[model samples]
Target chain A: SHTILLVQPTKRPEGRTYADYESVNECMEGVCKMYEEHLKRMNPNSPSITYDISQLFDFIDDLADLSCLVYRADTQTYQPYNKDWIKEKIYVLLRRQAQQ
Target chain B: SHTILLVQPTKRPEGRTYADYESVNECMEGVCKMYEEHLKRMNPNSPSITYDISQLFDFIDDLADLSCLVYRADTQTYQPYNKDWIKEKIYVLLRRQAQQ
Candidate 1:
């Protein structure tokens, strides 16, 4: 008898890119942690940025929930997009806050 | 004041595909769950296949841990690859088990 094995594709049939983080919230949290780490490394004597982080979490929650889409010429359809832009916005937020 | 924004690219410079599951074990567990769900939907009256699932988990754990690389002409180097082939192997294993 032939032995049978089962496997599943990492990607779905649809063209949507598979996300590393389970959810947008998780992704946002990771970025926040990364930024905090960056701060610790860059400015060791900086004040506790918990207040900034708290504000960030709220801002990111709203940003992540925002409906954003883009037209893909190749796909001939509109696809959800703009996490990168959100990151840019996040960075801007942090930088501005730090300068103040 | 001009805003200074920092944005991190989702893709790393090294070109490794970002993974959705945090760890190989997590990925294996997800696959096992998906297979069980498939069995439930496709063969409702089937025997409780915990034994098969257990074996599959062990097999996948080893399979995933196995060293895998592919020569990439474009990159002029060896790159990690083959989750797709592993999935094919998994499907074969499950199909054979079902037929037996």
Candidate 2:
């Protein structure tokens, strides 16, 4: 039984002059670290888990392109894409491992 | 250097009375088979690459949700989702596997 922790991206802070786009690049890096750590513990025998980072990043980009990121004028940041779906995809990658 | 085959989904045939939603389920199965076979050849040590099937299915679903599937009135089928992105993702998964 393996559990992939889906950590939400950095929340936006209050008080901005007007508006600004959220740093999706930063969010992508954050999740990649979390998922790669989970993959390491899940499969210690694997050489590298960072490869999945590309998939994760691309997924985020796809969602962003689809306008999945929602804006919050108050919080001054878009809600961090879809963590639930991210967890699902990570699980898919983990399950594909040799299971050693 | 492993290459994951990104096969396009089944094309719709000519002639339909009106219009109907394409069978996304069928397309999912088609890609799953193609990807899993690629995984097998990419990593012999891996046990059951079928796990990635779920991920691939969800990706297609996500694209569909985003209205990425374009309708083709003549063929009466939606143009299959993005193959380039799919290939990139498959490569990411493959790269994560241990070199045997």
Total clashing residue pairs per candidate? 15, 0
* Candidate 2 accuracy as TM-score: 0.21
Can you write out model 1's per-residue Cα lDDT over A19-92, one digit (the tens) per residue? 22444444444556644665576678886755454555454454323222222345333233354554564566
TM-score of chain B, per candidate?
Answer: 0.33, 0.32
Clashes of 2: 0
User: Model 1 residue A78 lDDT?
Assistant: 28
Screening candidate 2 with a backbone cut-off below 3 angstroms (N, C-alpha, C), the clashing residue pairs are: none
Instruction: Write one digit per residue (lDDT tens) for candidate 2, span A1-100.
Output: 1111222222321110111124443333345564467568888998776555456556444432211233345533233334555545545555554363
Candidate 2 lDDT, tens digit per residue, B1-100? 1111222222321110111124443333345554467568888998866555456556554432211233344533324335554445445545554342
| Candidate 1 chain B, run of 10 with poorest lDDT | B1-10
Segments of candidate 2 deviating more than 4 angstroms: A1-22, A50-80, A84-100, B1-100
Error of 1 at A94 (Å): 17
